[PDB]
Amino acid sequence: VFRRFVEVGRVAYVSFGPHAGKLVAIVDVIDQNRALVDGPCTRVRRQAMPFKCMQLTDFILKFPHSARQKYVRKAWEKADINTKWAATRWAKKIEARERKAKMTDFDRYKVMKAKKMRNRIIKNEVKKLQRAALLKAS
Amino acid sequence: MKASGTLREYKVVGRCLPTPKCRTPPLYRMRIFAPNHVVAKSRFWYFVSQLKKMKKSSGEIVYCGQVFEKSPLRVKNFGIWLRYDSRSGTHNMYREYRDLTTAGAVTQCYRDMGARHRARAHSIQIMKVEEIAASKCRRPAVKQFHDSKIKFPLPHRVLRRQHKPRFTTKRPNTFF
Amino acid sequence: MKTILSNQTVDIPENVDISLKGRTVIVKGPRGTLRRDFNHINVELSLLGKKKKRLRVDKWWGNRKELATVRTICSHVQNMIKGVTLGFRYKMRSVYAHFPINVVIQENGSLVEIRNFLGEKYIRRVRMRPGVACSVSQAQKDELVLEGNDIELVSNSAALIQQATTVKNKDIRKFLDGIYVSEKGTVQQA
Amino acid sequence: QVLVLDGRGHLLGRLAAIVAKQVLLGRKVVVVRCEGINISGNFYRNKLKYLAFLRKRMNTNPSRGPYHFRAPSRIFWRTVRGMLPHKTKRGQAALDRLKVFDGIPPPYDKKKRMVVPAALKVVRLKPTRKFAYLGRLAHEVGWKYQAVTATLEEKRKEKAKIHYRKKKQLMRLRKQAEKNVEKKISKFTDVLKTHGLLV
RNA sequence: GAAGCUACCAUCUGUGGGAUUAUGACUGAACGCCUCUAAGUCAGAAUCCCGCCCAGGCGGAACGAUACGGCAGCGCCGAGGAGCCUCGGUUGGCCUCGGAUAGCCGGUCCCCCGCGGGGUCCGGUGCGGAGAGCCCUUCGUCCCGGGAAACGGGGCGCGGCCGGA
RNA sequence: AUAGCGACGUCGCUUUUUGAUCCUUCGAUGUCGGCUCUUCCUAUCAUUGUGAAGCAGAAUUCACCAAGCGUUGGAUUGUUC
RNA sequence: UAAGGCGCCCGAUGCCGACGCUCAUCAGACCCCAGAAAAGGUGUUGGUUGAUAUAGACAGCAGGAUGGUGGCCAUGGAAGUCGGAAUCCGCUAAGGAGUGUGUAACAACUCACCUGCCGAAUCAACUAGCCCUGAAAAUGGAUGGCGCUGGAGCGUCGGG
RNA sequence: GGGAAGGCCCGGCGGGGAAGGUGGCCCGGGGGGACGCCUCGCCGGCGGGCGCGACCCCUCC
Numbered sequence A: 001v002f003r004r005f006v007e008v009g010r011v012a013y014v015s016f017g018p019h020a021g022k023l024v025a026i027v028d029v030i031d032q033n034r035a036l037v038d039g040p041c042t043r044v045r046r047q048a049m050p051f052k053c054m055q056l057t058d059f060i061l062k063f064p065h066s067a068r069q070k071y072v073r074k075a076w077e078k079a080d081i082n083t084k085w086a087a088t089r090w091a092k093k094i095e096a097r098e099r100k101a102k103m104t105d106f107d108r109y110k111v112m113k114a115k116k117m118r119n120r121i122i123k124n125e126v127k128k129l130q131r132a133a134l135l136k137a138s
Numbered sequence B: 001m002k003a004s005g006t007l008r009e010y011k012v013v014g015r016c017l018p019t020p021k022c023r024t025p026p027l028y029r030m031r032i033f034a035p036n037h038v039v040a041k042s043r044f045w046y047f048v049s050q051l052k053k054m055k056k057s058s059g060e061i062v063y064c065g066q067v068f069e070k071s072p073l074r075v076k077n078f079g080i081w082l083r084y085d086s087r088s089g090t091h092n093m094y095r096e097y098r099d100l101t102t103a104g105a106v107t108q109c110y111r112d113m114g115a116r117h118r119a120r121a122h123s124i125q126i127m128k129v130e131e132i133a134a135s136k137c138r139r140p141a142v143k144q145f146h147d148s149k150i151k152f153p154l155p156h157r158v159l160r161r162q163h164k165p166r167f168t169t170k171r172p173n174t175f176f
Numbered sequence C: 001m002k003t004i005l006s007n008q009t010v011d012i013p014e015n016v017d018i019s020l021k022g023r024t025v026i027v028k029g030p031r032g033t034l035r036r037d038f039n040h041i042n043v044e045l046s047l048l049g050k051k052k053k054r055l056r057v058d059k060w061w062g063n064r065k066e067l068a069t070v071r072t073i074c075s076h077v078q079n080m081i082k083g084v085t086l087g088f089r090y091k092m093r094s095v096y097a098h099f100p101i102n103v104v105i106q107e108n109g110s111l112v113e114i115r116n117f118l119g120e121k122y123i124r125r126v127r128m129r130p131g132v133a134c135s136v137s138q139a140q141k142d143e144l145v146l147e148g149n150d151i152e153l154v155s156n157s158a159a160l161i162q163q164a165t166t167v168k169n170k171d172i173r174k175f176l177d178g179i180y181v182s183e184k185g186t187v188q189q190a
Numbered sequence D: 001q002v003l004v005l006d007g008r009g010h011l012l013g014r015l016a017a018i019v020a021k022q023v024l025l026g027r028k029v030v031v032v033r034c035e036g037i038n039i040s041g042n043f044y045r046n047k048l049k050y051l052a053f054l055r056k057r058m059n060t061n062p063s064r065g066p067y068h069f070r071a072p073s074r075i076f077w078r079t080v081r082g083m084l085p086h087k088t089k090r091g092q093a094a095l096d097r098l099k100v101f102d103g104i105p106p107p108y109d110k111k112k113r114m115v116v117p118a119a120l121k122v123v124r125l126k127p128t129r130k131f132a133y134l135g136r137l138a139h140e141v142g143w144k145y146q147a148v149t150a151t152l153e154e155k156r157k158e159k160a161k162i163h164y165r166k167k168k169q170l171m172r173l174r175k176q177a178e179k180n181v182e183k184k185i186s187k188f189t190d191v192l193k194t195h196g197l198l199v
Numbered sequence E: 001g002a003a004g005c006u007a008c009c010a011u012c013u014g015u016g017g018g019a020u021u022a023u024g025a026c027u028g029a030a031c032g033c034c035u036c037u038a039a040g041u042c043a044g045a046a047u048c049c050c051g052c053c054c055a056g057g058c059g060g061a062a063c064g065a066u067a068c069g070g071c072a073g074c075g076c077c078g079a080g081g082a083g084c085c086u087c088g089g090u091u092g093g094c095c096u097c098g099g100a101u102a103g104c105c106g107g108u109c110c111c112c113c114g115c116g117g118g119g120u121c122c123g124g125u126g127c128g129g130a131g132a133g134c135c136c137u138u139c140g141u142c143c144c145g146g147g148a149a150a151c152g153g154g155g156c157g158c159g160g161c162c163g164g165a
Numbered sequence F: 001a002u003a004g005c006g007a008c009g010u011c012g013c014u015u016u017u018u019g020a021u022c023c024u025u026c027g028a029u030g031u032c033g034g035c036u037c038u039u040c041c042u043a044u045c046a047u048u049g050u051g052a053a054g055c056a057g058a059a060u061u062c063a064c065c066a067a068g069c070g071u072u073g074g075a076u077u078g079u080u081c
Numbered sequence G: 001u002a003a004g005g006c007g008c009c010c011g012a013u014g015c016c017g018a019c020g021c022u023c024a025u026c027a028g029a030c031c032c033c034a035g036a037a038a039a040g041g042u043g044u045u046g047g048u049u050g051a052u053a054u055a056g057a058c059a060g061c062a063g064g065a066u067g068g069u070g071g072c073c074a075u076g077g078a079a080g081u082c083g084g085a086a087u088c089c090g091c092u093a094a095g096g097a098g099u100g101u102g103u104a105a106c107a108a109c110u111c112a113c114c115u116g117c118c119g120a121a122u123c124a125a126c127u128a129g130c131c132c133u134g135a136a137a138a139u140g141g142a143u144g145g146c147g148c149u150g151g152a153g154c155g156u157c158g159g160g
Numbered sequence H: 001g002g003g004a005a006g007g008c009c010c011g012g013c014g015g016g017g018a019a020g021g022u023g024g025c026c027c028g029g030g031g032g033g034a035c036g037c038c039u040c041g042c043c044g045g046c047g048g049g050c051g052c053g054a055c056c057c058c059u060c061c
């Protein structure tokens, strides 16, 4: 079954191309594999864009199929897409990936040191729990 | 013509040189879809030589300039009247496309002609390009996009960038 | 040209229930259960509407070549529903000129033996498909009845025992002998 | 350091080209479960192609002529050989770095097998097209070990299911322990979260 | 005329399956009906492939015995002892479900069958139970303190029990 | 008209007939037949499985998958024929 | 850089290349060049022209499908159905001196045409792309090979 | 083309138009939420049901 459709007013996340990594709102469907979109608030000038480079999110905001950027921005601000996107888990994973990429060598060493303890404690406690479960089974 | 890249629309006006017979020959204007102004002028001379008794040696390009799209943010339906050469005989046709720019629609027309009839740019003679209302559209491939509540999914997304993780332990997912 | 959407819906009666796991459908009713998968069609099946009222088939972005599969899926599902609620009864008759065709049923309707087909010393032995029951019709001189729930299985058995009796090296326009499907109805009528 | 590939779902030539390049580049490659490989085009077409290959033999002495290997592993091996300069020492040394197998042998069943998305059927073929199974093609061309390898694969699958269940149980213990000890491993977690290894 | 060779000039023996071609069909759309075809399915042969049969790979397997009694040569072990010559490449490991893709993955008692398999429900889903990942992480030693551990670490240090074709 | 044929036309295929040419060979590639022996082609005479007849049966036509297996013994002639 | 190329052989697309077309049980794949035509396809994709359809079509399922008259010349027999011209009228919602099957002739069936149910698009005739039929030779065999079908094929194109 | 669009002032404001018709209205159904018909749950209570007839009584999507 399909849950994410392409209609007027859906928010999609651009994966690659000029505006890579930005949200956008679908205004119209030009053709089978091209849509007229704009990110009035995410800094993306109104333009055409292929379907091959956007990934659909589960955010819908209402405006007519050819409304101008004024009304598109009005609907975007009214629905407050930015904070909800920042709060969703998708953006959290993206932001964490960006953090890991940005990490320099000193924080790499610090992360190694912290992970050593984290794994050691977890492994010891897991051994304790496994022994306890075995004793309970016996 | 070599339909290189995306075409551009040029307004080209030309006239015969003044002669003792007539001081001021009438100026003739034409719309040329071309990669650049040089080939635009060449096509203008070709068409005007077919139409009138005019040649480049006995004429002059009074003006030649690109005409920009009037509304490049409104998706429009374009009807194109076209004249092309097959392997046996020549035919007139009318085709509709859907795009934001007249030049983009004409480029789509050239690519579609090459794909469907193996006709080449030196065979296609473009005649008329008009904005056509959705009620006046008559090709179903364009008409099916005329509704307020358009809605369709992307069913089978094929994995691109197949080579960046050239060896990956997942079998990729095609349902998003 | 690829159509944006082609859909068709099927209404199911109250006495039968339908459960689908992806593209395989299971139909359960008074006469039993029928299962059929459709992983070779690649369209969308939805059991929309509480009270299991309807089953909808969707196809997005399909040319005319695969747009035909929607109605064939719906027809297959309707046939499964019909065979589950009512069942399928294929009645066939044996036509002969001189030699009577002696048909005897064994394995409680699973094997059919045919003898004396045009003075034949050879004995035809045809096995029914699983879930198809053969019988000799009462109140009729010579006629076979095939009972089943799967229309494909019943009709395949009928075709098997029809093609088992064909004249060889003779004018088939004159030697009109063999068992032929007289009619295709249901076990019980509406 | 050896690249272990799984054949199931991969296309013959598409996988063979990548394997040949990797082998030429010096890497040791072992491809496993070759009978799961599939080829585009319908089964009758592919069987006809293999029969046409079978028909090619030296007229005067077939014993010296082309050798038509029937096992799927050897079929894949030969089509890889077709993409290497096997007449030279470099090509032969490369070809010696490749190992093919039907099923999954004991040296490799207890290992993680890699996957090549650039040669996968689900990626390279639209669903409406027809494909053929190399295992079935080989079996009805004259491979004699389709059933034995099937039973052995069934045994391997039923053992791997037990191993995977044990892995699931052990990890679930791991997660329960993690949420149990979050109290005293919290100060070790915010650093990973700030550097984006745990969010 | 022995023996031996030897003759349709004597006598004996000569095989079974599978996918399918042509063709005939089932269900069934496209195209309200129809249709062997488009998706799916069936029967099908001196053909094809294999079996039976002949050979047996710079291809493997199991098993037996493995060099005196004056010398001796050998096999296994002593985490057995120093070395000498020669051939090189390498410069951290990942010890594993099956598989789908017009769908998947993980928990669950709230139920049903034989710990496993189903049902409901709850979570994730551009895969944070991720290979775009995980694990180990090495300058060394000496004092005192805090955090984790007291069940842990190390032992051809041990004797057994299972685990594998 | 089209079971089976097919006029007046017109489009092809083959190199098992003959031509046309003269590229190789004249410090030589032994130049007709028959005998013997193997393999290959299909444009299928028979046999296996089929479809169509102006196919009642018998016989016989036309067509399809198809070269697996067979295709003889003699008079006359150096003959191929 | 030219010409030519960039899946592997084999240097170069390991571009998140663009738009389409095409399934071949003989696919196709680059000047010279190394193999094919006339004629066809309800395979599929475009295009041209003309029709009829809420005064309710196209299917499909059902009812009618009449008198003069078995029209005239005819043949042994021709009632419509082998033959020669014409083809009228009243009844009609409609019926042709007849579209076909059938008998020696009838008979009978059936069609043109009109009605009932069903309720929105449906018919043709051409034309051009790819694919398919046409398409048969001898040692086993050659888009250079492997192989390729979200193309590594065909057409138009872009960066590198 | 002294850039073509575009952005911001509800820019104000002049009139006009249909449609890929927003509300509104009419018809139809998929519904539900008040759950108004049974069944359990604790004669009064709330929660359990993953309850069960509704029907223009509305009433929302």
Ligand SMILES: [Mg+2]
Residues within 6 Å of the ligand: C169
């Ligand atoms: Mg006969």
Ligand SMILES: [Mg+2]
Residues within 6 Å of the ligand: none
């Ligand atoms: Mg068989």
Ligand SMILES: [Mg+2]
Residues within 6 Å of the ligand: none
């Ligand atoms: Mg068939």
Ligand SMILES: [Mg+2]
Residues within 6 Å of the ligand: none
């Ligand atoms: Mg079969």
Ligand SMILES: [Mg+2]
Residues within 6 Å of the ligand: none
């Ligand atoms: Mg070193």
Ligand SMILES: [Mg+2]
Residues within 6 Å of the ligand: F029
């Ligand atoms: Mg010689």
Ligand SMILES: [Mg+2]
Residues within 6 Å of the ligand: none
């Ligand atoms: Mg000599």
Ligand SMILES: [Mg+2]
Residues within 6 Å of the ligand: none
């Ligand atoms: Mg032949």
Ligand SMILES: [Mg+2]
Residues within 6 Å of the ligand: none
């Ligand atoms: Mg090259």
